[PDB]
Amino acid sequence: MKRIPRKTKGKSPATTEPGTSNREQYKARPGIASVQRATESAEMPMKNNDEGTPDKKGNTKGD
Amino acid sequence: NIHLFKQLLNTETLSVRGANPLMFRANVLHMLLEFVLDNLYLNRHTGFSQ
């Protein structure tokens, strides 16, 4: 058994392989950080538009 | 002698020991141009001795 918390309120021998050496000299172009920053803002879903719809009590909420 | 083939367009070459192969022709062309330009001289007569 495992526990997963909710996110919203509810009803309540030698081993050194001859190729694993790290000799990196490549700089990404465009850089990883910049495009990652942009696409992270791209990930966000569009905002909710709740205005004009009723609530659990039955009164429409908004202005 | 790598540095003589990376002085035209190797601006993105991070490594100091490396060079981009795809600009070899351009670098060689510039090298040949300098080779020609550096030799534009007239041979002078100095003097002799038996």
Side-chain angles (χ1 to χ4, degrees):
Chain A
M1 196 213 54
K2 193 184 286 185
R3 291 172 69 189
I4 288 149
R6 311 183 32 110
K7 78 177 287 176
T8 309
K9 313 189 67 60
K11 208 82 167 296
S12 302
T15 304
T16 302
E17 186 172 358
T20 56
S21 179
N22 290 18
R23 294 287 191 183
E24 78 279 8
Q25 290 301 280
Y26 181 57
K27 183 178 179 180
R29 182 211 211 199
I32 290 189
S34 174
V35 64
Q36 281 212 286
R37 194 171 320 310
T39 187
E40 187 143 320
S41 166
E43 269 190 313
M44 183 176 282
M46 60 196 206
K47 67 183 291 322
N48 200 332
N49 198 3
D50 291 331
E51 202 155 20
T53 69
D55 59 47
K56 54 192 291 273
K57 197 145 303 182
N59 309 297
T60 61
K61 183 178 179 180
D63 304 298
Chain B
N1 271 304
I2 183 65
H3 74 274
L4 294 174
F5 310 105
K6 69 178 265 191
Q7 68 195 3
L8 277 296
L9 300 174
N10 278 271
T11 185
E12 301 286 80
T13 300
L14 183 63
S15 167
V16 74
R17 264 181 321 281
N20 191 318
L22 289 202
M23 283 73 74
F24 278 164
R25 191 186 302 173
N27 286 273
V28 170
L29 275 193
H30 163 261
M31 191 195 77
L32 295 192
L33 171 58
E34 290 180 352
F35 178 89
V36 176
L37 280 179
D38 200 29
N39 266 291
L40 265 48
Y41 287 89
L42 289 184
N43 286 310
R44 191 149 199 74
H45 170 87
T46 68
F48 300 82
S49 64
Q50 172 148 47

